[PDB]
Each structure stands twice: as C-alpha cells, then as structure tokens.
Amino acid sequence: AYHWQSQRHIGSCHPSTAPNNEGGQGTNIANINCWQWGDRSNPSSASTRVSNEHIGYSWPEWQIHYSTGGPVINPGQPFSQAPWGSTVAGTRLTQGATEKAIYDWNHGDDQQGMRETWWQNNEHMTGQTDWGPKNAHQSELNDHIQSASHFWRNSYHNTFGPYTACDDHGPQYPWGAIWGKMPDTTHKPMMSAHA
Amino acid sequence: GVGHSTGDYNNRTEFIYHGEKVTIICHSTRLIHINMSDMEEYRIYDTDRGPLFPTTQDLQGRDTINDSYHAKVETPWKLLHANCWGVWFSPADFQQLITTCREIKPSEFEQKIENIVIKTVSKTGAGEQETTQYNNDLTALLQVAQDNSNLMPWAADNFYIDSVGYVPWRASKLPTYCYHVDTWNTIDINQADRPNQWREIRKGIQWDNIQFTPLETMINIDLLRTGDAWESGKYIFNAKPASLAYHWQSQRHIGSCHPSTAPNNEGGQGTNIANINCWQWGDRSNPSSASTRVSNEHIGYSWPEWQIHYSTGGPVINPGQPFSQAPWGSTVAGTRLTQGATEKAIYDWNHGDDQQGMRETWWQNNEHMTGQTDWGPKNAHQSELNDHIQSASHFWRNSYHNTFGPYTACDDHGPQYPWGAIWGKMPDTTHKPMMSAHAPFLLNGPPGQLFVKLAPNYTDVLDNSGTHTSRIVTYGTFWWSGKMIFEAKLRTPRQWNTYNLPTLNEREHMQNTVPNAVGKFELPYLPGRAMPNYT
Amino acid sequence: GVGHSTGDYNNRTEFIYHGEKVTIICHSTRLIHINMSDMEEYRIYDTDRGPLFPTTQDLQGRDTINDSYHAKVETPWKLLHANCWGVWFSPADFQQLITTCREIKPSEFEQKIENIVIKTVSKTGAGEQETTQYNNDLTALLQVAQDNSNLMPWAADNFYIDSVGYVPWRASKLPTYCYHVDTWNTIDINQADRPNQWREIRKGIQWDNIQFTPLETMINIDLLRTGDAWESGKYIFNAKPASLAYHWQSQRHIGSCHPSTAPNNEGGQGTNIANINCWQWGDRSNPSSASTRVSNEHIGYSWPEWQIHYSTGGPVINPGQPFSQAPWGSTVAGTRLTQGATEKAIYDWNHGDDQQGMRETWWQNNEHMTGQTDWGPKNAHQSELNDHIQSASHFWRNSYHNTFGPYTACDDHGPQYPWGAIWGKMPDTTHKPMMSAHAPFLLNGPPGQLFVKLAPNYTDVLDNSGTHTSRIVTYGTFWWSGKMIFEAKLRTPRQWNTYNLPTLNEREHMQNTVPNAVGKFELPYLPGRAMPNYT
Amino acid sequence: KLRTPRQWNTYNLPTLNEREHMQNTVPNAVGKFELPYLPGRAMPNYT
Amino acid sequence: GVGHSTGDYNNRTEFIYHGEKVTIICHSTRLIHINMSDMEEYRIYDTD
C-alpha cells in the first residue's frame, strides 16, 4: 500500500462546528484545550500541535556528491509532486525523487530505435512530500507574529531526525529489483531506495 | 440482573514491592455524561482556514502558519481514552512513582463499562410554564464498540486533550470522534515571481481516492440495556521501559577530568596543567585542551528550528530536540525565549465557571534537562582545525544546519503529568520512528479505541425533518472503569549528598492545588524528570 | 431476561479462503421502525386504472399500456425481506466479490429478531399546547410470524423495492403486505369493428372462485414482549451457481480463425484467403466465407420486442434477451435507444429530504454484454441460400419473428448491485422456467417471508368508530439480524494483458457516493458482469 | 497476507497509467509491444 | 541421458489461498542465446 496519510492528518480532527448549509465551508472553533509547540496562547491551531512522530524529511537536493568515487547523486526521500503543479505534460518538475528508466526492444527493430523511457513521478505517494525551499525556519515561536528578521524563506538543510518515519518507493514492475545485497559495513542502511 | 446493581466503583492505587521490582496496580473509575449525537449521519466538510490566517499582505509569509484547514469526517461516535497520565494517578501518588522507581513499562490493561443509565427529556408546558419531566427509559440502547484489531483510524491522543476527566468526583463528558481525509492545503512562500508573498496552490479536498470508513462496517458492536456490564477486553502491553531520571550529564562531562593541580588556597580557582598526553581532534599540538578530545559519543544535536514545514499536509512544525534554556538567560518571567523544544499546554476547568474563563496554560521549559542543549546559531563550523588559530575566513558564526548524526544520543522529554500520553500508536511505515517526542511509549499497536453511542430513539413519524424533529432528545450516563499494571525498578541512592526531591514548580504554589472555598482547583505539573542521574 | 440486553448488533463481512473455494460469511443487522396497522381488518378493493391510462382517443391503442388496475387484499401485516444485494454487501465489499470469484451459490441463511422495544404516543394538551408524552409500554405485543412452508402467496420481491434499508446506520421502515386476487382487466386493441381504437372487455373482479387466505389461519405465530428474541429458523439453499463473468464472446467468434495470410506491413489490414476447405451452410461453392459455416451452437435469439402482451392479466411486457446496444449507436447521452432488454430502476432517499425530491433513476444499458446482441429488424430471412447472389424477391429485410430455437444458448443479466434480488420463487408449473430474467437464482422454494405486526392495544370502549378511535396509537422498534453463507470459486488470471477492473460507471462519479456534507449519498451500480471471459 | 476491505466506498483499482494506453501492451500486428508500469503502491491505506 | 530430453519448460504462476496467508508459486523458464567471449583473457582498462 501507499500512504496518502501525511503529517497534520495523523491525530484527531481539530474541533469544529458542522455546517448548517450544504455544503460547508465551515466552521472552525477558536478556544481549545490542546497542546501547542511554542509558547503560544493565540491562536491555538492545528498548524501547531504536538505529535508523537513526523512523516517525511526535507532533503537538500538534487545534491551532486563529489567523491573518489564520483560525481554521484545522493538520493532524497521519494514523494509525489502531484500536490504541486508538477504533472506529466507539464510542468514536469523533478524535485522529488523521480527516477527515469531506459528500456530496450519495447519497440525494437521497428525501429524507434531509441529509446523506451518512463519516468514515474511517483505520483501516488502524497504523504511524504517535502519541497526543500518551501520550508522556512524561524527563531521565536512566540504567539506574537514573526518580525522581519528571524524568518528565512529559502534554506536547503537536511531535516532528517530521529523522529521521522519514511518509506521507499517500493516494488515497481517490471523493472524493479526484488533484492539487492546489503553492504557489509559497521553501520547498516536503514532503508534501501529502489530495492 | 434487571436493575440489580451490576458493578463496582473502585478508585485506588496500591503499590507492591518485592524489591527487585515494583508492581503498580492503579485503578480508576469515573462517571460519564453522554447525550446525542445531534445528527445521526456521517458527514464530511471543510473547516475554514483559521482565525489569523493571512487574508492579505503585508503580513506576507510571516503569518502563513497557524491556519487549520482540514477536511474531516464527523461521525456520531464518541470515544473515551485513558492516555492521560492524570487519569490513572493522583498527584500525591505520582510522587511515589517518580521518587522511588526510575523506569516503568506498562504491562496489562483492562477496562469495563457498568452500569448504564439512560433517561430522556420530556417537555410539557404551554410556554407560560415549561415543565421538563426527566423519566427513565428502561428500554434504551447504549451501544458500545471495541477495536482490538485497530481497524479504525487512530483518533486517540491527548493532543486536543479531550480525555475522561482527571478529577474522580466530577462527571466528565466525552469528545466526538472524527478523523481526517485526503486534502491538499499546499501554500507557498517564495513566491519566486512574486518575491516575498504567499499563494494557495491547491485546495481543499481530493475526491478521487478518498477513504470513507463508515463504521459499524468493521467491528462487532454490543448492545447494553440498563443492568448489563460490557466487559472487558484484556490487553497485554509489550514496550521498552522509559527512564524517569533526567540527565544533567552532557558532552564534555562524559570522560575523565582533564588533569589539573589542586588549589592550595580555599577555594581554588585552579589550577590547570598544560602538557598532556591526551588525544586531540585535529592536527593539534598546542594547546591540548579538554575542549578538543575524542569521545566515543556525542550528546544532543542542533536542529534548525523553529522550522515551519509546508506539506500537503500543513503548514506544520517539525520538532527539535528537547532541552532546557536555563543555562542561557531564558527563564519564566524573562527572558522567556522558547528556542528549545518547549510545548505550552491549554487546559479546561482548572478554574472553570469562575470564570477565568480562558484559559489555563502551562508551558514547561522544560528546565530540568540541561544536558542536550543546542542553541542552533550559537554553534560555528570552521574548515581547518589546525592548532594555528583560525583566520578571518573559514569561521561561520551563524548557521542553522542539522547536526544529527549516527554518533548522537538523545532523549525525549519523557512522561509528564497529568497531561502526557502514556502511549501513542507507532505508525506503520517501512522505516520506524527511533524515538517519539511527547510520547513515552510507542506500540506496534495499542489497546484500540473504545467507542460508545446512544442508539437513536425515534418518534412515530420519522419522514420529515427527522434531524430537526425525528428522535426524542436523550442523554445517558454510565460508569467507566479501568485497571493498569505497571512494572518498575526502584532506585536506591547513588549519592551521599541529599537529593532535591520532586515538588510543584515555583510558578505553582500550594493553595491553588487544594480545592478553593467554592471547590475549584488545578492540578500541578511535576515531571518526571524528577531525579538527576549520571551517564 | 426482563429487559437485560438480549441481542447483538453485528454488521460485518468476513471472507474465507481455502483456495479451491471461497466461503463468504456476510452478517447484517439493521434497525426497524414499525407503527400501526391503520385499520385492523383485511380488506379487498380495486385500484384505479392508472395515471395516463387512456380516457379517449386519438391516443387510440398507443397508450393502452401503463395502466395498473388490479384488485388486492390489503392486510395488516408488514413483511421484511433480504432479497436485495445491497442489504448484505457494502459496495467496497461487493468489489472483492466480483473481482476474485467467478460464481457464487448461496448456501445457508439464518435470521433472528432482537430486541423489541414498543412505546406509545400519549397526547396531553389544551390546544394552546399539545404535549405528546412518549412512554414505554413494558406490556406490549409484537407478534412475529414465520413461513417455512411457503403457504402464504409469495409477496417477496425487490420489484417495488421496499426492502430493509441498505445504509446500516439508518432506520428503515417496512412495506405493507398485500397480494393479488382473481381479476379480469382484459382490453382490446384491434378492435376489428371499430378499426384502431380500444375497448374494455370485462372488469374488474370475479367473485366466484376468489381466494381469501386470511392469515393466522395457517401458521404458528409467536408473541414477543420486550426482552425476548425470536429466533431463528435455519434455511439451507440448494441452487445452481451463477457465473459473475460476462461473455463478449459471440457467434462468429466461437470456432477457429478463418485462415488468412499475415500482413507484411505494420499493421495489416490483411489479408484473406479464398480457397478453403471448410463446411458451408447451403449449397455454396463460392465464396466459402466465415459468414457461413456450421457451428455446433448459436448464441442469442432475436425477439420481437418490445411486445405489449394483453392477458387477463395485463397489459404486461414479455421480456426479451438481455444484451448491450453499445455496438450500435446507443449509449448514455445519446442515442439512448432501449431496444435491448434494459430495465430502469427507481430509488428512494439516495438524495432524500434535500429534496430532489423525485427521483433517483439508473437504467443500466446493460453495456458490458455484447455477445448476445440481436436487434430484431436488422436480421433478414431469405429463401434460397444458393451460392448465386440473391434475387429481388426472397429477401425480407424487416421481420420481427421469434428466433429462439433448441440450439440457442443465452444468459440473463445476472446479479446486479445493490437493487438485484438474490432469489425469487420458482413458480409451480408442469413446465418450468429455463432461466429467470433479473433473478440470479430460482428455488423450489425459498426461505419464506417473515411477517411482523404490532398486536392491537384497545382503549376501554371498542364499540363505536374503533378504527377512528378504538386503540391507542403506537409504534414499535426492533433490531433485525441475519446471516448468509456464500460459496465460490475464485478466478485466477487467464490473461497476460492487464484486466480492466470493476469500478463505478462513467455516469457516476466518486463524491456522490461518499456522504454529502449534510449526510446524503447514493450507492453505486456495479455489475457483475465485471470480468470478460471466453466461451 | 491479503487485505480485506477496510472501506465502505469503492476502491479505485490498479490499472495502467494515463500515459499508457491499452493497444500498445497487446502485441502489434508485426509482434512488437511494451510492458506496462503498474506500482504497487496500488491501494491507499491509513497510518 | 546422451541426448534424451533432460528437462522441462514450465512458465506458470499459481496462487494458493489458506486465507490467513497467500502462498505464491511463480515459475519461469526462458531460452538463452550465448556466444563467445571475444577475448579469452581477463582485462583491465579505463573507460573514457
């Protein structure tokens, strides 16, 4: 299965009044009764509430990694761009982990002759989506709204942390790999992208 | 039965000591006041954006947070959950927990519902007088639904506390069960086009794959007339114990004392020895100093926060590492800075109907943990570690990048009373959370929710405006019971010097905890986190 | 008992797989709201002709149909029946039925009624205020009558659906039991006297042989006070399995490929071989062609329809063969032609109290079956089959005669959801129906009807205008339960290419199925008929 | 371990993506065809 | 043997259901066309 379930969907519904009209369109209740992340009196809102976990981690990518030993690409977290404008036939942006695949003889000796390509999005997983520059880190979480300074709109730093929970893009057909060799290393890969 | 009293009300907490081990049996039992169930029907709708959500600039990207636009499926099911600590422990009891025993893992859980009483409102009057006559219905249906298989989506948290009340002698009403469905809330702050202002990419709901898991479509449901007791379910936890102590022990305190000469005067004030004999991190001849030495581990990880995280899927905040600001100027009553992970908590009826009326707040610091402290911008990364002092370039004073690494060792802020959550559901994901912030325990699955609703009672004519006038207004009441079993290992003193024992914080003071002359009082906050310890 | 909860509410569907075989256990349980029983007495009367029934020409013979003049014996008995599919299967479940397993024969049926609650209306007021006080009657009689012997005439169909509701959380009221008695409705269209206009030969009822089978005159009836559970009856079906697949395979596709040369170009476009080597139907030398070749069977039979059938006894329609019009221009949103067997279905409360208010319609095509298609006038019968091409005479382009013959092989339109009928009573007749249109199963006898009525509760004085004021207005409520057992054989893939899986039709789209913000929704239509298959 | 339905509403079953369409999968008149891409990833689920 | 057909070609996939559990037995068998082995010798070289 794939998880559309994402962060801010995991806990209970933020209390609200059911709409009288059909359909609402509302409505929201201000005074609660819930935890908050900072020193935050107002407004208490579902944007900020404590949750035992976090889904997805922003990655600074695409990252060209120069080692002995490369250039190589260090993977990011697989997620769809569908919630954003990216879709097949525009706007096509690859910012997720989206791996094109070249094939042979799907039409061969026709000849195309080159090549058979795919590039899954991969569109079904909307839960883990992190578009790195969209995030913003701010110093003070005080309920007072944020000043000019202290708010950094574009930053690419790795957000992976011990709380996070992430998924690979899982078995995919036909061209996937049922298995691959775990390396022999004192630390071991926690999850293997594409395998 | 047919009315004969079918149940018992036992609220007590009784410790056991066999001295290698501490078994804690804590009962609880509490009244519950349930009514309708205003509309009989599963519904789905979009909550509005939010109170302060930006309508227009120049608020620009600043206020993009604190917006709560979600789509829920409101359902006519009320659930009640034990996840609060305060449910199972009277404050004077929770002392003996954090004083004696240094870690506790819940073991066995049991609960039973007896005995149901349902009565209906009947209004009789001309409008000069309206005489409401409250009469029992011996034929009435309180239907209880248990999940041992965790099929329902997990709604049970103390986030939005809404848990069965803490005060044993007060009747506590239940929350209403609803859970989220697939939405797209995505907004942007770049904007890249459009510098500096925000847009709403796509909203608000996606009907293609939406999941409606109308209940009563999974689970065996039981009917309870007056005089019967739904019981029980028998749950057996398995979970990793969690230590009650807090670690003042931090990095640069873990290894041996950097050799030094004892002072002759009283007191020194010194003194330090230059020539050693120790490892160093870089190519470093001089000075060899305890600032730089190799250690098998590192405590704490700087996090870039606070980080507003925009996903489908939010705005949401991705947590940091919990630590105190006490070593820095931050303290209650100034300078108050929140830069750690410090989570304020809103409460109800601590003074209610006084009325405050709004609200009861806390915001622990949390002050006791000084070990893990990382104030992100304080750190600096420099290129060359050569013993030669650093040049103008190569030294970057303020940088916010994540320092979490495979060497690090970190701790959550642990069990905290009353408002904590004894457990929360570990997600189902190929990678699993290594540690859960604000929850002392994660479970492959927990004891499932307990669902309860009064079955509808219709007037003769159900056809027109049934919701407005279909069924007879009704409210039920019943006692809820529970049993927990905790295991523990008590701490015997590791010190010669006298401990500083747990007590309510300086912000709190006693006579607010003991009931007011009119019977209003608040519970204290006492983590828990009680006793310092080595590492 | 004496009130103690006597019953359980379980709505669930749990598959079993032993892999040769698929056992499907589908529970259902649903509330029921019953009141009087307006008049206590068996009655017999004639319904009026009909809304559009012709009063006068020039409508002439055209409108002679759609008249419903029947004589019924209205009785004070309400019956509830499970024959709808939607009763036993949630749509998401009925997927797994038609996806996995290709035929299912119901096996075992069981049902039980618990627990009864009966309360009466009492009106107290001066007319400035009328205060209705709804109070239980612990002494009240809900009397349930079972037929295991099928003595009562069969009233149980989903024709005029009126079945216990589909939505498990909504309280569904029952239909009122009545059945037909001997009548003569006969009308003529010739008229032969009188060309072109219609007369009414004889009406409306015949008292000579009329059969009044006043109930309570056959069957053991049980009384239920609050706190007892009428159970059960144990029924065991025996019936012929019915395949879930649909056959695109039609005549001229059954035998081997007519030999041909593969094309060199991509793609062909050809090519065909003239000289064969095969059988032919007539005296036919040239050309031997796949149009004419002997085959052991024939699929489908042209029917002359639509045929208005005038009997005693009607007007009624005699069915044709079910097939799609998709190969012809007919499709939803044009050209819509109904010439197949295509049966529209009227529904209630799919959006009710919105109000639409009228009505919820469907009209499946039914599009998936292309094999059996016969559009009557398209066919042509010619005298000489000689290889010489046909002359002016001997070729009759339009003729409507029945082509059904002993060679033919035909299929009904099979189980369809929700509104289908799992079973219907095979008639008792020296010749028996070979296949039943719209009913997937016929039974020598089915599980009989289940009859229920609230026993009357009289005021002290019953003598004058008892029907107007005799007995105290009353309504009961109780839960109905059921159990089915289906057996199946699941289909493993016979294809290399990817199947096209079952889903709601293009007419339907998702967010109408998931409840509306005010809680109104419709169920999808998804036969079932799901997977193509060979023949 | 097979999944029994957790929903009331009808699932959206797996099928080849909109980019793909059927007659490319079934062999061409000269016998050339491609295989579909269908993760797999098929069914939505809770968490 | 000495030529007698020594093998079987079975390409099939057959599910099993005991309903707690699904056992999937999927065979495959496929022809293979191999030639030399242009140079008999282990070699080492740098790709451009």
Residue numbers in the entry:
A (entry chain b): 277 to 471
B (entry chain a), C (entry chain e): 33 to 567
D (entry chain b): 521 to 567
E (entry chain b): 33 to 80
Task: Show me the paper's own sentences about this structure.
The BuVs, along with CuV and TuV belong to the genus Protoparvovirus, which prior the BuV discovery contained only animal (non-human) infecting viruses, and are classified as novel Primate protoparvovirus 1 species. The VP ORF encodes for two overlapping structural proteins, VP1 and VP2, sixty copies of which assemble their T = 1 icosahedral capsid in a predicted 1:10 ratio. The VP2 monomer extracted from the refined 60-mer capsids of the BuVs contained the core β-strands (βA–βI) and α-helix A (αA) observed in other parvoviruses and large loop insertions between these secondary structure elements. However, unlike the animal protoparvoviruses, the bufavirus capsid contain three separated protrusions surrounding the 3-fold axes, as has been reported for members of the Dependoparvovirus genus, human parvovirus B19, and the HBoVs.
Movie frame micrographs collected for these VLPs, at two different cryo-EM resources (West/Midwest Consortium for High-Resolution Cryo Electron Microscopy and SECM4) yielded capsid structures to 2.84, 3.79, and 3.25 Å resolution from 29,596, 7564, and 5234 particle images, respectively, for BuV1, BuV2, and BuV3. For BuV2, at the lowest resolution of 3.79 Å, only the main chain for the residues 381–391 could be interpreted with confidence. At the top of the 5-fold DE loop, BuV2 residue 160 adopts a different conformation to BuV1/BuV3 residues 161/163 that are structurally similar. This structural difference of BuV2 likely stems from four amino acid changes in the DE loop compared to BuV1 and BuV3 that share the same amino acid composition. BuV2, which is the most different, has more rounded 3-fold protrusions due to VR-I and VR-III and 2/5-fold wall is thicker and more pronounced than BuV1 and BuV3 due to the larger VR-VII. The melting temperature (Tms) of the BuV capsids determined by DSF were 64.9 ± 0.2 °C for BuV1, 77.3 ± 0.3 °C for BuV2, and 73.4 ± 0.2 °C for BuV3. Interestingly, BuV2, has a disulfide bond between residues C210 and C289 of 3-fold related VP2 monomers. The residues are located below the section of VR-IV positioned on the 2/5-fold wall. This interaction is not possible for BuV1 and BuV3 which conserve the C210 equivalent residue position but have V290 and P292, respectively, at positions equivalent to BuV2 C289. The BuV2 disulfide bond interaction could contribute to the increased capsid stability observed.
